[PDB]
Subunit: 345 residues, 2 copies
């Protein structure tokens, strides 16, 4: 259990420090032998090494079994050359560890439906996992350029690119409700066809898992009308963006969402929220996604699924019991974390 902690900027340290407080308490109670070391990353690393992902930090993650990420970015670095911008650092961490799967869970915990924008009956039972490809797609496709009267961007996918993500999706589904849904736009684009036949072809090795294809727009609507029926949803870069964001609102607020990026290298877990610079050091940040990030870390990086599910509910309990500001409450970072540590400990 060697974890490389990278607090980052803004509320990163506030919230990551909360997750570590929950980790250390589980460590004491069941003695998993946690071991962690924080490393400068993001804007911090810049203000100290002129680079967002300095070698010491680069070497820190390589040697760890998992990485616990905080927030990244802010005003102090917007005016810097994209080459070393805080965000391009996230890119180098993903590229360096060949992480290509982005796991974004959207779940409604029993007794919390009321917080959802959807009807109690529609929201009840939601538990979907959008698996998104992080390396390919339109975001990186070339050629890409601008002009006085024309703009172009190409969406391109390789065979090996699609196989892995698809394999992660199935593997993942095998451990859950065994239903995978591949989402594309094969009815119009060649890339969707390609994707479809490829996934189709890789799903052969997983007969025990039910594969179902859908178009992105059809899915856009199925995820609001019947979100409770899905399990694992695998899709491309941009589509995974549009779809993870959409699903992320089904539980209520955005600061409730963890994330993991799986690949061949060291796995990365991080909240899906930003630095929120202005509210830093104000004790009002919600560590929910941070803790939830440490739970996904426990289950997908260490296998402690029984334990991850343990902190998950302790968090659910706390959100209902003593809700934080952003969810209509007075419980600040410190307080909230107290309620959670209480149960997990």
């Amino acid at each position: 259990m060697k974890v490389a902690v990278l607090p980052g900027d803004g509320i990163g340290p506030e919230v990551t420090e909360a997750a570590l407080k929950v980790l250390r308490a589980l460590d004491e109670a069941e003695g998993l032998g946690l071991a962690y070391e924080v490393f400068p990353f993001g804007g911090a690393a810049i203000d100290a090494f002129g680079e967002p992902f300095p070698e010491p930090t680069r070497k820190g993650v390589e040697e760890a079994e998992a990485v616990l990420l905080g927030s990244v970015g802010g005003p102090k670095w917007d005016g810097l050359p994209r080459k070393i911008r805080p965000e391009t650092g996230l890119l180098s961490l993903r590229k360096s560890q060949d992480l290509f799967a982005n796991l974004r869970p959207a779940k409604v915990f029993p007794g919390l439906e009321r917080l959802s924008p959807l009807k109690e009956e529609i929201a009840r039972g939601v538990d979907v996992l959008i698996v998104r490809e992080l390396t390919g797609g339109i975001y990186f496709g070339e050629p890409r350029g601008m002009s006085e009267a024309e703009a172009w961007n190409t969406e391109r996918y390789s065979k090996p690119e699609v196989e892995r993500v698809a394999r992660v999706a199935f593997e993942l589904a095998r451990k859950r409700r065994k239903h995978v849904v591949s989402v594309d736009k094969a009815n119009v684009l060649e890339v969707g066809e390609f994707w479809r036949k490829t996934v189709e072809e890789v799903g052969r090795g997983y007969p025990d898992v039910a594969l179902e294809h859908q178009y992105v727009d059809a899915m856009a609507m199925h995820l609001v009308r019947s979100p409770a029926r899905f399990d694992v949803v695998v899709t491309g870069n941009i589509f995974g963006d549009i779809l993870s964001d959409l699903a992320s609102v089904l539980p209520g607020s955005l600061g409730l969402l963890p994330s993991a990026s799986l690949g061949r290298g060291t796995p990365v877990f991080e909240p899906v929220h930003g630095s929120a610079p202005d509210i830093a050091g104000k004790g009002i940040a919600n560590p929910t996604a941070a803790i939830l990030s440490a739970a996904m870390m426990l289950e997908h990086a260490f296998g402690l699924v029984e334990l991850a599910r343990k902190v998950e509910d302790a968090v659910a309990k706390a959100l209902l019991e003593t809700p934080p500001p952003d969810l209509g409450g007075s419980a600040g970072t410190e307080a909230f974390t107290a309620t959670v540590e209480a149960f997990t400990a």
Copy 2:
């Protein structure tokens, strides 16, 4: 007021006939001098001309001021060469008339919130219009091709391409709640940057309208968390596709959705539903989307905004008063229309 009516297939005729009933009554009442001619289109046109968009129908829409379309497609023609499949007909109509804007309204009528997937409070008040570009984007971007190990599609946009659609959006918002929202992914793609500065640049000629920029994924979330705060939403082809569809589920049912496609040629108005061939001639089809497609026609093609808003409510009343089966009711096509033409 010369209207080219294309009933199509499936429930097309059933529902198009219902909208014509509502139109003829208004025409009697205020005497707007409606004039209409039905033309064979879709499967029907195929069964009779071997083509889905025959020259006689081609010439019928050219000469009309508006086009009232029904449904298209069905089992009888799925096994045909895509070159003359019923659906490719819809594309020939579009391409022949240079229709670039695709208006797809999603609105929850007061008293019907309960039908929505959203909570009564969140759904209440929704009235959003997603204007989508129909000619450009990744759907037609070249180069596009497949291979043994590689697939590629290119999303490209021209300057003139984006101006027009942005112009439609503003002009439309001017007549509504004066709030336009452009949607892109300018934070990552060059196409989004180009679209943003272009729309930004045309919005200058519309100072009275408030422009707002958002990224497709942000919007995918805002349109379920706070749909009631938007008015006109303009976007690209693929993005308009994912967004229209998402918004279209806000109002309880699919059959309550009209749509219009504006361009340089004859404007086209049609339900956002299919042929539902097995339920044809059963009298249970809901004409709401067709009627509402006649309203949109009235406002957007003939300027009768006061009139269109008149049929709109008559429809709303009817939905609450005598609701159709798909909405939990016994009121069949014929009966529902009765309750509508009564008010209008």
